[PDB]
Structure formats: C-alpha cells, structure tokens
C-alpha cells in the first residue's frame, strides 16, 4: 500500500523478515544490498537503484555523511522500542544523542581458520598471515579500513590513525602480504572457506557462525593484537520519499522478538538487550559472538578518521590493482 526503499549490507536480513514486516504494516519494501560503506557512499551520491528511505552505515561513516548533509534527523519519539538498546552503544561521540543513527547490529573481524585443514593453535596473531607458507591461500575481507587496521595493528599503531606516515608504513607492510592473498570478499566471506579454496584469513564473526551451522570446521581466533570491532547503524537519507515508513521499519527492527529471531539465524550480535535475554544459551554465550570484556579491551572499535579516509581509500585501491 506504501513502498519503502532499503539498502543494507548483504547477510543481515534473512529470508522471511521483510515479508513479516509487510504482513504487519502493509508496507512493501524494495530491498537492495551493498558490500561496503565505500560502495554505499558512491551510490547514494549518484543513484536510485540503491536505496532512498533506509541505509545502514558503520558508525565511522556517520559524521562524514551527516556533514555532507546526506542523512537527516530521526524522530526517536516515533521509535518506541528504542529503550531496548543497551546503553553502552549510545553515548558515542559521532552522534551523542542518537539523532542521526540507530544501533542495529555489531560484530567483529578476526582470523577464521579451516579446522580439518589447518591447526587453529598454529595461527595466533595477525602477524602470522605474513608467513611465506600461507602463499596463495588467504582470504581478506574487501574493506579498506579493516585491511589497514590488521596491518596497522601488526605494526603496533592504532587502526584509527590519522598519521599519513603510519598509514604509509601499513601500506608498505600490506605489500608484503600480496602473494598470500587468494581473495577479497565482503559479500559473505565464509563462503570461500566452505567452498574450500582458502585455508585461513579474515572472517566476520557472524558469517563463520552461519557456516559452522552448516558443518564447516571454521574456527575463530582472537588475534594477539586485537580483533576489529565495528557497528552498523540505521540512518535515513535526506532525500527519502517515505521517512514515515522508514521509522516504522526501524521500530520493527527494535522490537525484541524480531532482533532475537535474526541474531539466532545470522549470528551477528544485537545491541538490543531485551532481545539478548531471549537468545538461546548456545548463542548468547558463544564468546566469538558476545566476546568477554578482556577481549574487547584488547581489540579496537573502527572510528572516524576524517579527512584521512582519503589516504586509506586510495592506498587500498592501489593494493587491489597491485
């Protein structure tokens, strides 16, 4: 009866959701996926094929979009399930009062290892991926900031640096890893491991879950230097034709049964606290999904770099060329 345009990352909405929403609301949602923020960005500033009413950027893209005037304000008064959000995902300084973004799903990037093929006790750090022996067998997520952060951490620098010298040094190191790289995948990184065309590499903790779920000896190792933490937030584009509907779609995503239902299917963790008490105990206590306080303490959240995004972005495409 109404139509809504939703652009989101690839494995987050499982078959059955959007339809459920439609049963309830009578709103028809035209769904579209993207595999990276860089992608989603270059699109929103050019076309319609992508999405207009609802998009989902990483919190590190929120200030930059907000500034370009790309996303508008969210009336959270119409978002009555907002109170279910864990308060530790709300004081963030890129949107202190959550007027432009709504926590949706969080996760981590770490080392995925093919059990029945490689000994998980043998890989312990990001540093190990540079060993000559992993030649032509590594999977890398197709994310500039995640690839830099892994090399940046291997060197002892912050993954949120804004120092071109540091970045450049990571670039240099990233060049040594080139022979080891079999693929770049931001679609569903578990896939190549399951197809078994890669032994070890980077892995999102949620897609390794859906893969185990299907019987793949995919083990997740927290690296000695960190683990890359990130969060995806719902935002409403400035040129949205249906912001009223977008706020419905958001409150739907905030009802605890919904979030509960998706998190058990896609494994990525929910910042929805209500929905967390509802989670089966095999999921809620899986430390590769809801890692302990000492482990987030040792990893680092991907944050805004500002104008320096220019350097990561360019230096990454060079890499993907070279």
UniProtKB/Swiss-Prot annotation:
SUPFAM superfamilies attached to this UniProt entry: Periplasmic binding protein-like II
Name of this protein? Spermidine/putrescine-binding periplasmic protein
Give the matching Pfam families: SBP_bac_8
Q: Does the keyword Membrane apply?
A: no
Task: Name the protein family.
Answer: Belongs to the bacterial solute-binding protein PotD/PotF family.
UniProt binding sites for spermidine: 11, 60, 143-146, 302
User: What are the UniProt keywords, alphabetically?
Assistant: Periplasm, Signal, Transport
Naturally occurring in which organism (per UniProt): Escherichia coli (strain K12)
Role, per record? Required for the activity of the bacterial periplasmic transport system of putrescine and spermidine. Polyamine binding protein.
Which InterPro entries does its entry note? SBP, Sperm_putr-bd
Please state where this protein is localized: Periplasm
Organism superkingdom: Bacteria
User: Looking at the UniProt record for this protein, which Gene Ontology cellular component terms does it annotate, in alphabetical order?
Assistant: membrane; outer membrane-bounded periplasmic space
Q: Which GO terms describe its molecular function?
A: putrescine binding; spermidine binding
Q: Which GO terms describe its biological process?
A: putrescine transport; spermidine transmembrane transport; spermidine transport
